[PDB]
């Protein structure tokens, strides 16, 4: 199949101690531009960094003094990491990502609900939940009898589910008058045409 | 540093005593997969991504070997300065809209450091699914814990979090 490639963490020459390594690939306009950054963290103290915008291992603390100076000497290490912008970043983006994350499209599930039990001519609230969609770009708008109602509309922030799906709730302050038609509008890049779910008074 | 998409490839976390490690792959906040370090097999978050891509689980075991090595060297280079604990915090919410009859409950713990957390007032575990530690900009971690449940008025649920930064455990009711 396609190959996910990981960077080559360069090596160094009751208490608890934690070490961490990173390999961040910042893509803009596709592969039109890429910025590669590697980070070495010891006890939440980032001490050594390589930034493709620099082109040389730099010391982030006094602890980075040796490791930065050392990794810059041996070119078998520097030229390797420097070139990881193509072997790890560009490769992963143009290869495995396109066949997975950059291809995932999940349409949302739209359901309207009354938070308080319906009492005609008494004020109540409508809630248009929008769940299970990827990516994150989504616009939800509320219509009352064919009129964009932006007043009394409060939408939660984007919610990360952690399994490549999101969630958004958009509450609407309203009062049910008989005959009224409340519709929830959902526009998403995974929808050929906007989804419209109605709720009759 | 903004950009359109961000790939957090090659996350290598190790800590001793305990020889605890982790090797994961993230892209836009969500995790592509981790590598099981005791089974030596890549475990994908989405099974669909498994059939579409591949990653040699051996491309990590070695990285963690490098990370175990650098940690031992750095612990001595600082005269053995221990890591500072950090108080975690949790927020519990359901994945799909909770209709009282099908659904799963998610506990989102953040500000975890060091990465050692233990996630009807009774021990329950139907189809629990925990994830590997996600990286934060402040180099602490966050982790999610799904729970498969069916809601009823008589039944309320909680999320227990055991951490060294907490003098005593805490729980968030829902």
């Amino acid at each position: 199949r396609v190959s996910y490639y990981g960077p080559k963490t360069s090596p160094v020459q009751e208490r608890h101690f934690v070490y961490q390594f990173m390999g961040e690939c910042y893509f803009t306009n596709g592969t039109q531009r890429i910025r590669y950054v590697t980070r070495y963290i010891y006890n939440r103290e980032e001490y050594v960094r390589y930034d493709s915008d620099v082109g040389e291992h730099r010391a982030v603390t006094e602890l980075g003094r040796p490791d930065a100076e050392y990794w810059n000497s041996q070119p078998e290490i520097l030229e390797r990491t420097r070139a990881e912008l193509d072997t790890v970043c560009r490769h992963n983006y143009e290869g495995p990502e396109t066949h997975t994350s950059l291809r995932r499209l999940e349409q949302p599930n739209v359901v309207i609900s009354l938070s308080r039990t319906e009492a005609l001519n008494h004020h109540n609230t409508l809630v248009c939940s929008v769940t299970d969609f990827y990516p994150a770009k989504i616009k939800v708008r509320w219509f009352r009898n064919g009129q964009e109602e932006t007043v009394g509309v409060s939408s939660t922030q984007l919610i990360r589910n952690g399994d490549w799906t999101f969630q958004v709730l958009v509450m609407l302050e309203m009062t049910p008058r008989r005959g009224e038609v409340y519709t929830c509008h959902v526009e998403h890049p995974s929808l050929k045409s906007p989804i419209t779910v109605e709720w009759r008074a | 540093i903004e950009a359109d998409h961000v790939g957090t490839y090659g996350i290598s976390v190790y800590q001793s005593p305990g020889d605890i490690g982790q090797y994961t792959f993230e892209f836009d906040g969500d995790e592509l997969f981790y590598v099981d370090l005791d089974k030596k097999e890549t475990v994908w978050m989405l099974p669909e991504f498994g059939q579409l891509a591949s990653f040699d689980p051996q491309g990590g075991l070695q990285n963690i070997a490098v990370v175990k090595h650098n940690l031992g060297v750095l612990t001595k280079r600082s005269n053995s300065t221990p890591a500072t604990n950090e108080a975690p915090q949790a927020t519990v919410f359901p994945k799909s809209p909770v209709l009282l009859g099908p659904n799963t409950l998610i506990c989102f713990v953040d500000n975890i450091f060091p990465p050692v957390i233990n996630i009807n007032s009774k021990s329950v575990a139907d189809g629990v699914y925990e994830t590997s530690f996600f990286v934060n900009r402040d180099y602490s971690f966050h982790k999610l814990s799904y729970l498969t449940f069916i809601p009823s008025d008589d039944d309320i649920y909680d999320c227990k979090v055991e951490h060294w930064g907490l003098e005593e455990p805490v729980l968030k009711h829902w």
């Epitope: 790890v88 490769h91 | 051996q58 491309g59 075991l61 070695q62 090595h69």
Partner: T-cell receptor, first 111, second 113 residues
């Protein structure tokens, strides 16, 4: 360099045979290969560092042990006549381009 | 995945060129070291080549790489009898950070005096 030990051993089927290997190159990776006619060099076990051993392509019958960064050792718990071959030890740095091999061990498992 | 080397053994007369070939299946291979093993001792690196280049020439030994057909060829010139040995052809996918090398079965060289 890399010095395997012993360089020649004769053993009986069913006994325990423990080949050993030491290195003075400050390497991190060590491997155990067996050479056979018509099958080339085959990987049995390898180790990225002290404490961990990773299986190779033919790990059946052998056990590995990496107690030191300098020492790697095979272990034939239950020897069989199918094991007789010339065994080789190697090592290389992380992301190590080159492989530094041992001199070789001639094993003879007889009934 | 597998790697093949043909012929299984070769015999060349002194002062003339030996040609040892090697072919690989996995298109992701990019590092191609060659290990020379004399009787009685282990193998040692002789000459390597990366998929970027088509040939690295090291005096008497030259490798010719073909990314298209996924084929290789080692050329030993003015071969002396001190070259009679076994020549392995290895290939690793460096991007995969495996550590594994996956050798070929190796050709056997015989230099006629």
């Amino acid at each position: 360099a890399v010095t395997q030990s012993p360089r020649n051993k004769v053993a009986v089927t069913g006994g325990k045979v423990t080949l050993s290997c030491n290195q003075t190159n400050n390497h991190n990776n060590m491997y155990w290969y067996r050479q056979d006619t018509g099958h080339g060099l085959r990987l049995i076990h390898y180790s990225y560092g002290a404490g961990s051993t990773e299986k190779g392509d033919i790990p059946d019958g052998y056990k590995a042990s990496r107690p030191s960064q300098e020492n790697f050792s095979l272990i034939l718990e239950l020897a069989t006549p199918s094991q007789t071959s010339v065994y080789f030890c190697a090592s290389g740095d992380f992301w190590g381009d080159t492989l530094y091999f041992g001199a070789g061990t001639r094993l003879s498992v007889l009934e | 995945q597998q790697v093949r080397q043909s012929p299984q053994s070769l015999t060349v007369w002194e002062g003339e060129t030996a040609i040892l070939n090697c072919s690989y299946e996995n298109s992701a291979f990019d590092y191609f070291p060659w290990y020379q093993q004399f009787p009685g001792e282990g193998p040692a690196l002789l000459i390597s080549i990366l998929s970027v280049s088509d040939k690295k020439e090291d005096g008497r030994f030259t490798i010719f790489f073909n990314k298209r057909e996924k084929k290789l060829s080692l050329h030993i010139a003015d071969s002396q009898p001190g070259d009679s040995a076994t020549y392995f052809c290895a290939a690793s996918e460096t991007g995969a950070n495996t550590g594994k090398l996956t050798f070929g079965h190796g050709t056997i060289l015989r230099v006629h005096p």
